[PDB]
Design a protein around this ligand. Structure first.
Ligand code: SF4
Ligand code: SF4
Ligand code: SF4
Ligand code: FCO
Ligand SMILES: [Cl-]
Ligand code: NI
Lengths: 256, 419
């Protein structure tokens, strides 16, 4: 048989899908596999078909997406949450304001037949078996995962900060020489330190990691010298970790 | 017995079509836009201007750079910054980079399977080797442009307040001008391929076409006046005076009227209002095909995108020449977050994009966004009606194919429509 792969969409910018779709010899790098649901490129997809690997992109932001992830979980052997939207609830997850206030601010008092929920990751409603990180994730994050799966192995995630990748390429640390509030120390690696490589601080697009190794002589020292309060770091980290209940503790520990 | 298309394939975002039919024929076409809302307009209220400026591109991946670059203009108008000549040039060129990649994506991977019998562009790889080879070269030019200048083809963190975080070596821009003018014959090929595709007469009728009038003297993306094809022209900050939105029960996106009627925005709307402003091979391809680029048919949208690919490929060889002649270029300038209000209207690949930003205390107090697909959703509903009326008694799966063909001609990015 062939490995049945599907790709399914919650609420998202479709960028994670588009990154896959733009991988050029994509067909020639999944030769073991067949793509049985992917509505963005295939008019013949079927949603309630069972699959070996399910890729879900986006936050659970409607009542129908709730009942939907319970269907994919039921119909799929491996559930892979893909992207900052599906892994952490995304940039649409960093107001804490309740749904009504947001509904009222954008739509006025109007109503809509469908039911909007508060942005929420896939982990909130079903068991996720793997996460591919980033907003969007790299091409190599998909090559690696699709690659390791289609041989029978199981993929594993990088757990060290961007800073290792930034020093290896020799980028000047814009946190130090420039005092921009780079989230590298607390964002997992993988992107080849793209943003510091262009002279811009990292905004954490690949999800918070724990600062359990003194990669700075004193991150506390630099953070205070360049004038960035604990409240200022926690909020910048919310941009991509609006539901991470440890984020508050990792920062306070840093400033310890 | 309504006829429903639950999930429309080969568009961006989640959407459906449902046709209500009765004794008098077809009564109603509802485009069910279920793509959940993400409340961009609300949650960036009371966040710092750069923090929100970094998040506005996650509205949409196909038009990512259009979002970031239009929101930048608006913020840079609020705080009263003004860019520099060459920083604005390279801005227009990163935008063009998004024009080419989006157009090529849409013409080749989303539309063309319908005319070829294929459910999927992935499938026609071995029957249309030459065509896809050309698709991937044009798409990948545009993708390379956005990597070099924006840092990434999706979500361009190199475009910042005041200019760019880092500008490439001069040799790279010169290689871009090489890769550009090599693409020109591929852009023409595409025009010709699409010039020979059927503009189905069932949707032929009158359309109102709104486009941003370009400042300067060429077919462009930036400007301060919105023309309508009736012969009107109104200022971009007054967009709220001449264009009225409203919720509807079957959509998370907000419809829009101009003088109380549906209109359409995009590549054809720009060709209607602004074709005299072309030049280069685009001019002739327009002048030799005026009867294929009429305002009276949404399928004319597809060929106009092909015509635009040709133009912007030339338009960008000239814009780089401008930037290359302010060499060297300090990549960005200081920007004082003095309070202000700023409205910007650009042409995203799908039509007009309007960002309205207000800054109090270097924070965002007010934000208003309307995406070209949100404009278009009303016209789309009417054109599907005309299709579905000449075929509600045909075979359903056949009705389905042509309804969706109509929808795909707008190049809907639904994610843009529900921000
Ligand atoms: S994670 Fe990022 S790229 Fe992926 S769908 Fe969400 S916003 Fe788009
Ligand atoms: S703090 Fe940022 S700029 Fe400095 S080394 Fe870490 S990732 Fe690079
Ligand atoms: S540097 Fe940070 S924000 Fe930039 S791509 Fe890497 S993880 Fe994402
Ligand atoms: N093109 C495009 Fe996206 C939409 N609608 C934007 O702007
Ligand atoms: Cl057909
Ligand atoms: Ni879009």
């Amino acid at each position: 048989g062939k490995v049945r792969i599907g790709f399914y969409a919650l609420t998202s910018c479709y960028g994670c899908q588009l990154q896959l779709a733009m991988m050029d010899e994509l067909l020639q790098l999944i030769p073991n596999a067949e793509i049985v649901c992917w509505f963005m490129i295939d008019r013949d997809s079927i949603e309630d078909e069972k699959v070996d690997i399910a890729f879900i992109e986006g936050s659970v932001s409607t009542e129908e997406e709730v009942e939907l992830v319970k269907k994919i979980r039921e119909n799929a052997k491996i559930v892979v949450a893909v992207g900052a939207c599906a892994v952490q609830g995304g940039v649409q997850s960093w107001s804490e304001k309740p749904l009504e206030e947001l509904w009222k601010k954008v739509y006025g008092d109007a109503k809509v037949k469908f039911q909007p929920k508060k942005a929420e990751p896939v982990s909130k409603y079903i068991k996720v078996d793997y996460n591919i990180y980033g907003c969007p994730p790299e091409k190599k994050d998909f090559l690696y995962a699709l690659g390791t799966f289609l041989i029978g192995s199981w993929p594993e995630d990088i757990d060290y900060p961007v800073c290792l990748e930034c020093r290896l390429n020799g980028h000047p640390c814009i946190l130090l020489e420039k005092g921009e509030p780079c989230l590298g120390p607390v964002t997992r690696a993988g992107c080849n330190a793209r943003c510091p490589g262009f002279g811009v601080a990292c905004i954490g697009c690949r999800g918070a990691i724990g600062y359990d190794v003194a990669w700075f002589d004193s991150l506390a020292k630099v953070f205070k010298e360049a004038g960035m309060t604990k409240e200022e770091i926690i909020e910048r980290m919310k941009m991509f970790n609006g539901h991470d209940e440890r984020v508050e503790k990792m920062v306070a520990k840093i400033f310890s | 017995l309504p006829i429903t298309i639950d999930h429309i394939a080969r568009v961006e975002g989640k959407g459906g079509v449902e046709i209500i039919i009765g004794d008098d024929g077809v009564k109603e076409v509802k485009l069910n836009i279920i793509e959940g809302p993400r409340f961009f307009e609300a949650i960036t209220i009371g966040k710092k201007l750069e923090e929100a400026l970094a998040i506005y591109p996650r509205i949409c991946s196909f038009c990512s750079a259009a979002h970031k670059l239009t929101a930048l203009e608006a913020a840079e108008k609020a705080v009263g910054f003004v860019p520099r000549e060459e920083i604005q040039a390279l801005r227009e060129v990163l935008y063009i980079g998004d024009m080419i990649e989006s157009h090529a994506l849409h013409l080749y991977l989303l539309v063309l399977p319908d005319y070829r019998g294929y459910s999927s562009p992935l499938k026609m790889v071995n029957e249309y080797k030459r065509e896809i080879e050309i698709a991937l070269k044009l798409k990948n030019l545009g993708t390379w442009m956005m990597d070099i200048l924006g840092s990434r083809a999706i979500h361009q963190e190199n475009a910042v307040l005041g200019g760019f975080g880092k500008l490439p070596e001069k040799s790279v821009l010169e290689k871009m001008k090489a890769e550009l003018r090599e693409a020109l014959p591929l852009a023409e090929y595409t025009f010709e391929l699409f010039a020979k595709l059927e503009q189905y007469s069932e949707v032929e009728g009158p359309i109102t076409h709104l486009a941003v009038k370009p400042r300067g003297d060429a077919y462009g993306i930036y400007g301060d006046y919105i023309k309508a094809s009736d012969g009107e022209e109104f200022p971009s900050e007054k967009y709220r005076d001449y264009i009225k939105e409203f919720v509807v029960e079957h959509s998370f996106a907000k419809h829009s009227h101009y003088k109380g009627r549906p209109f359409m925005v995009g590549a054809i709307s720009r060709v209607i209002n602004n074709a005299d402003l072309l030049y280069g091979k685009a001019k002739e391809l327009y002048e030799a095909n005026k009867d294929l680029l009429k305002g009276t048919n949404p399928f004319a949208n597809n060929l106009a995108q092909a015509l635009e690919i040709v133009y912007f490929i030339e338009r960008a060889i000239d814009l780089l020449d401008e930037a290359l002649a302010k060499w060297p270029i300090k990549p960005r300038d200081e920007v004082e977050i003095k309070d202000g209000f700023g409205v910007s209207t650009t042409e995203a690949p799908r039509g007009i994009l309007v960002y309205a930003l207000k800054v109090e205390n270097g924070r965002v107090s007010y934000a208003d966004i309307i995406t070209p697909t949100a404009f278009n959703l009303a016209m789309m509903e009417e054109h599907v009606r005309m299709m579905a009326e000449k075929h509600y008694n045909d075979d359903p799966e056949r009705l389905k194919i042509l309804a969706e063909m109509v929808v795909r001609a707008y190049d809907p990015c639904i994610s843009c429509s529900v921000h």
